[PDB]
Structure 1
Amino acid sequence: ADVAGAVIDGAGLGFDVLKTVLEALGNVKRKIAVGIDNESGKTWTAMNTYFRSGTSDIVLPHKVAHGKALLYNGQKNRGPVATGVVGVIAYSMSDGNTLAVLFSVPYDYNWYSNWWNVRVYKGQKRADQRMYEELYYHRSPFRGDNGWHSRGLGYGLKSRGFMNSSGHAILEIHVTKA
């Protein structure tokens, strides 16, 4: 009767609202483009990229020789999901150590910001949740605040990086001999 018609009309209104909300959520773009210059004097072998959030549509370049550039990119999961792209790239270095690069492009910018970090681990370590937590919570990550930051990585290596503050984040790092 009248109640059923009102319920159906309300359901249709809720359906339209849900369609609009889902389209808006799916139209949100959170992508990261990582470019790392290798002036470290040693060849880099890709180990893995651990994605705490998001994913990548391309192959992680297996080898990055000295004087070359690692080019990589990722983005948030397809669909109306309120997650960004957060991850750690782990490359094996010729000296036997691991270069770890943390990137974080969050979905909700009301509570979170773009973050990035670079660190060198002794031995060959694959990027995982523990490495991400170390780089994000305990190793003093740099804010993606459209600023250049330099930090000595050790092992005769230093890093100079930059990351913008937008959702279309670009993380450019130069890892050079210290």
Structure 2
Amino acid sequence: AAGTIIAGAELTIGLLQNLLDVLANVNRKCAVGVDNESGFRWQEGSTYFFSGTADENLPYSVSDGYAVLYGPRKTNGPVATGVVGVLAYYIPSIGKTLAVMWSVPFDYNFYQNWWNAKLYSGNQDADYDHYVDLYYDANPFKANGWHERSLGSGLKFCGSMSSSGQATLEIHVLKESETCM
């Protein structure tokens, strides 16, 4: 009697372990290259994750002519969330903090890759209120080739994001007088 009820448990557990091995093996990541051609040194590298993590620290500071390379990724195991976060640096030469946001979803049926960058007044930690401002209020970019925008304070950026789910985000931060790389 109950034997085939175990057979029903076996079919259920077989389907469930296949689900959890799929949600575990689905990989999402961003390579986040942010290149400082701005003429100003950046410091106090701060990070926030709405989703995901990174296995490495930011550089403490970024002098002129050097890049942040950062490798944020999806949480291990069957978590079903993408990579979504902010990185921010203080720029003491202008009294403002540069923040950069990326979103690399789990579910491309409802979401797509987005990125943004902006300056905020004073020294600020990266947190949820920068994520909300960069992702909803400050008009982020799609992962559909190169885009350029002013930051204010004599600075500018150009950047692009791959549209895949293992995405490269590249940003060059420049003075307004300079041609994008």
Normalising by the smaller structure, the TM-score range is: over 0.9
1:162 is matched with: 160
> By how many angstroms is 1:6 displaced?
1.5
Is structure 2 residue 19 aligned with structure 1 residue 21?
yes
Give the ranges of 4+ consecutive aligned residues of structure 1 lying more than 6 Å apart after TM superposition: none
Aligned ranges for residues 62-73 of structure 1 at < 5 Å?
Answer: 62-73=60-71
**Structure 1: unaligned runs, 5 residues or longer:** none
> By how many angstroms is 1:60 displaced?
1.0
**Aligned-partner residue type, residue 91 of structure 2:** M
Give, in whole Å, the separation in 2 of the partners of 1:22 and 1:53: 18
SS at match of 1:175: strand
Query: TM-score, length-normalised on structure 2?
Result: 0.95
Count, aligned residues: 175
1:9 is matched with: 7
Give, in whole Å, the separation in 1 of the partners of 2:67 and 2:128: 26
1:111 is matched with: 110
What is the aligned-residue RMSD (CA, Å)?
0.8
Indicate the larger mover: 22-31 or 42-51: 42-51
Aligned ranges for residues 142-161 of structure 1 at < 5 Å?
Answer: 142-145=141-144, 147-161=145-159
1:133 is matched with: 132
Identity among equivalent positions (%) equals: 55
SS at match of 1:165: coil
Give, in whole Å, the separation in 2 of the partners of 1:93 and 1:136: 22
> By how many angstroms is 1:144 displaced?
1.5
Kept in 1, the 8 Å contact 2:45–2:61? The answer is no
